[PDB]
Amino acid sequence: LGSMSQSNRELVVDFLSYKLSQKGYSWSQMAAVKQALREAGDEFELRYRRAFSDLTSQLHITPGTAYQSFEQVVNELFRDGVNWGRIVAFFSFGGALCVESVDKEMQVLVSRIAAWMATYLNDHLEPWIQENGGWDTFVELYGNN
Amino acid sequence: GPLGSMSQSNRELVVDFLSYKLSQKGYSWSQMAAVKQALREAGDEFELRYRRAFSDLTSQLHITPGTAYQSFEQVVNELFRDGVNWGRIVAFFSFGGALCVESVDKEMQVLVSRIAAWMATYLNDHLEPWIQENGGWDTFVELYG
Amino acid sequence: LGSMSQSNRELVVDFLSYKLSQKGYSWSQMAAVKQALREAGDEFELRYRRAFSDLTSQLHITPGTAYQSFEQVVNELFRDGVNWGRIVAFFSFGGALCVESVDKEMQVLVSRIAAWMATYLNDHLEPWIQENGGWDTFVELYGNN
Amino acid sequence: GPLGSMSQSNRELVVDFLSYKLSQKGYSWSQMAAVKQALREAGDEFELRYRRAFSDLTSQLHITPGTAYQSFEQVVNELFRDGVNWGRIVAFFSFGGALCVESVDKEMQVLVSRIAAWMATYLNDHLEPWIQENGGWDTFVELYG
Ligand SMILES: CCCN(C(=O)N[C@@H](CSCc1ccc(Br)cc1)C(=O)O)C(=O)c1cccc(C#Cc2ccc(F)cc2F)c1
Numbered sequence: 001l002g003s004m005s006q007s008n009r010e011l012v013v014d015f016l017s018y019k020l021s022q023k024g025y026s027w028s029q030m031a032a033v034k035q036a037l038r039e040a041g042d043e044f045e046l047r048y049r050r051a052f053s054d055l056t057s058q059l060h061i062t063p064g065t066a067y068q069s070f071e072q073v074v075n076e077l078f079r080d081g082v083n084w085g086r087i088v089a090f091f092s093f094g095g096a097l098c099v100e101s102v103d104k105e106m107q108v109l110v111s112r113i114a115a116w117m118a119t120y121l122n123d124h125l126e127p128w129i130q131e132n133g134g135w136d137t138f139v140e141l142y143g144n145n
Numbered sequence: 146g147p148l149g150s151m152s153q154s155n156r157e158l159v160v161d162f163l164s165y166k167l168s169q170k171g172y173s174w175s176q177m178a179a180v181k182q183a184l185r186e187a188g189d190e191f192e193l194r195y196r197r198a199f200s201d202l203t204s205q206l207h208i209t210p211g212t213a214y215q216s217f218e219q220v221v222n223e224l225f226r227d228g229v230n231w232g233r234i235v236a237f238f239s240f241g242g243a244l245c246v247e248s249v250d251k252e253m254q255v256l257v258s259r260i261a262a263w264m265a266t267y268l269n270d271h272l273e274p275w276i277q278e279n280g281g282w283d284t285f286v287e288l289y290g
Numbered sequence: 291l292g293s294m295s296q297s298n299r300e301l302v303v304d305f306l307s308y309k310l311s312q313k314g315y316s317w318s319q320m321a322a323v324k325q326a327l328r329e330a331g332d333e334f335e336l337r338y339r340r341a342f343s344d345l346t347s348q349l350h351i352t353p354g355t356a357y358q359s360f361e362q363v364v365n366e367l368f369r370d371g372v373n374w375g376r377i378v379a380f381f382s383f384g385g386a387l388c389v390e391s392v393d394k395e396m397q398v399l400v401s402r403i404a405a406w407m408a409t410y411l412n413d414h415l416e417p418w419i420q421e422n423g424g425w426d427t428f429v430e431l432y433g434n435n
Numbered sequence: 436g437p438l439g440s441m442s443q444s445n446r447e448l449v450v451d452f453l454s455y456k457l458s459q460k461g462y463s464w465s466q467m468a469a470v471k472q473a474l475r476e477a478g479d480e481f482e483l484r485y486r487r488a489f490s491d492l493t494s495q496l497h498i499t500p501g502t503a504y505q506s507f508e509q510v511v512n513e514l515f516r517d518g519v520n521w522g523r524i525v526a527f528f529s530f531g532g533a534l535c536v537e538s539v540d541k542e543m544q545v546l547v548s549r550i551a552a553w554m555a556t557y558l559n560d561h562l563e564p565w566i567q568e569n570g571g572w573d574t575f576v577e578l579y580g
């Protein structure tokens with residue numbers, strides 16, 4: 001489904017978000033969390049690139065994977081507990097797995113991964129986030145103002 | 146999710162993160178994602194190259210608090226005085242971004258969402274038909290990104 | 291160009307707009323003007339259906355029509371002056387002409403008509419509107435609260 | 436144009452008017468327009484048929500001023516307790532519309548934009564993947580409108 005008058009509005013907000021963040025300003029909390037997370041991810045990938053080779057064959061997540069199985073896989077990443085660094089890792093692994101899915105010509109898995117990750121974030125990680133200083137605490141620790 | 150302007154969605158944060166990461170590898174979350182990214186990139190290049198033109202824009206372009214859209218439309222018209230093209234449209238985004246940045250600096254953050262709404266308005270009424278007629282943003286992506 | 295997370299937000303606002311207006315409430319001024327105009331148009335069409343048969347052959351507006359020629363055609367509708375009733379007529383004639391364009395398998399003309407009508411509204415009619423009580427005066431006279 | 440939430444575009448008013456008129460003839464401005472229209476229609480039928488269920492919803496569904504999204508998500512979950520389908524999704528829109536209408540009645544117009552944002556949020560996080568997997572809104576249009 002598409003939306004064309006929103007399209008121009010959407011470009012606007014995205015571009016202004018981008019240019020504000022370059023000066024440490026933020027369109028909104030959501031925009032601040034986005035810049036922060038992108039940045040935290042970049043740094044993460046720079047340091048742990050070694051972990052991102054052949055993720056497909058190791059994580060056992062395919063298009064026909066059930067969310068419960070996805071949940072079991074991610075749970076392994078958080079076996080010794082949830083902390084900010086582990087939450088960044090979660091995003092980075094999702095991202096890398098998407099890229100592989102595109103490399104391997106299974107684009108279909110990308111939107112499956114998005115939806116799985118959103119559910120997991122919703123049910124598992126955001127509640128922890130709310131008990132540990134909230135999304136603003138994420139922005140203080142990883143964002144650029 | 147974090148508190149946004151129109152929702153506090155977890156999916157929205159995930160989707161932004163995957164879009165970014167897909168783009169770093171030569172891929173796209175979607176056509177919109179690709180447009181957004183090409184436009185950020187084009188804005189960055191424009192602002193560095195024509196850096197000398199980005200001082201006291203709130204004054205040179207007469208955008209103050211209490212400005213009405215008709216005034217804004219009057220100023221932007223001069224930019225497209227000799228016709229629309231993709232360069233002038235990049236200029237339009239960049240100037241509007243620098244205006245917002247200038248606004249926050251001066252503790253006029255109130256201007257920012259107003260500038261957004263004026264830019265979206267101007268696009269819709271003045272720029273859209275030229276854009277469509279010229280192959281759409283799809284063409285922008287192909288010529289730029 | 292499409293936009294998918296806005297898509298759900300867009301449905302929301304549209305549906306809530308619709309349900310509010312059914313009780314004489316309005317999401318925004320823009321939403322009030324939309325309900326009012328749709329209604330004014332319905333009434334107009336009911337009374338003057340006789341004027342809407344074979345508009346294509348009489349208005350001389352094709353896909354290759356220049357906006358200046360479009361402007362000349364619409365100007366004829368406003369020859370004896372602009373008033374609210376004539377402004378409603380303008381919308382109704384545009385609408386009917388679009389429908390014929392779809393009947394005659396020239397859909398391409400519809401978006402051309404939208405853009406022409408938006409320019410004409412912008413340059414000719416909205417200024418008159420601003421000197422005659424504004425968009426709220428349109429809502430008082432044609433809307434349902 | 437009239438003052439909207441995200442812009443004051445003239446095109447936006449035109450486009451809304453032509454969409455309406457195209458739809459009255461069995462046509463569509465676009466896929467989104469068609470979805471919007473089918474959904475309004477489906478909401479109308481649902482609210483008349485299940486009219487008896489639409490009293491004191493602010494109370495039965497505990498949506499008051501100062502309500503947080505987590506609370507809202509908790510209430511809406513019960514509606515989809517036994518699974519998602521297109522009927523339950525129509526119900527979701529209608530109830531949210533009646534809630535907004537109820538809000539304005541009680542001089543709690545402040546709730547309306549908050550309800551919008553919560554509905555958009557819930558759609559994105561909870562309903563989107565089911566919708567996509569089930570053929571998208573394109574399927575809704577084909578089964579309903
Ligand atoms: C094939 C194992 C992948 N992996 C690693 O390679 N870890 C590395 C450690 S170095 C990477 C690292 C660095 C810092 C932190 Br904090 C956590 C991890 C290793 O064991 O050598 C993992 O740590 C790991 C273990 C278990 C689950 C996952 C995952 C995942 C995942 C899948 C999908 C998705 F959408 C999101 C995800 F987080 C990731």
Ligand SMILES: CCCN(C(=O)N[C@@H](CSCc1ccc(Br)cc1)C(=O)O)C(=O)c1cccc(C#Cc2ccc(F)cc2F)c1
Pocket residue numbers: 195198202205206208220221223224232233236237238240241242244260264
């Ligand atoms: C103070 C800036 C005035 N300005 C310039 O400095 N132009 C420069 C050219 S260098 C900038 C440039 C470079 C390439 C292109 Br294509 C277009 C412009 C000059 O001719 O010396 C403009 O190009 C100009 C002239 C008239 C109006 C505008 C504007 C604007 C504007 C205002 C608000 C907003 F949201 C967006 C806008 F684009 C911008």
Ligand SMILES: CCCN(C(=O)N[C@@H](CSCc1ccc(Br)cc1)C(=O)O)C(=O)c1cccc(C#Cc2ccc(F)cc2F)c1
Pocket residue numbers: 338341342345348349363364366367375376379380381383384385387403407
């Ligand atoms: C082929 C003539 C169409 N037309 C009529 O048939 N008028 C009727 C009068 S009855 C319709 C009517 C009723 C009330 C009012 Br106020 C104004 C008109 C007639 O002369 O018998 C017009 O009045 C007319 C005359 C000149 C121009 C136009 C137009 C137009 C138009 C075209 C495109 C567009 F996007 C918007 C437009 F308004 C419409």
Ligand SMILES: CCCN(C(=O)N[C@@H](CSCc1ccc(Br)cc1)C(=O)O)C(=O)c1cccc(C#Cc2ccc(F)cc2F)c1
Pocket residue numbers: 485488492495496498510511513514522523526527528530531532534550554
């Ligand atoms: C006070 C209404 C409670 N309610 C009912 O009356 N259900 C009725 C069924 S008749 C309504 C109906 C008819 C068909 C379908 Br499919 C689903 C519901 C009943 O079982 O007697 C619900 O269906 C119900 C139950 C639990 C939660 C909700 C809700 C909600 C809601 C809140 C906010 C919002 F923005 C959107 C929402 F959908 C609605």
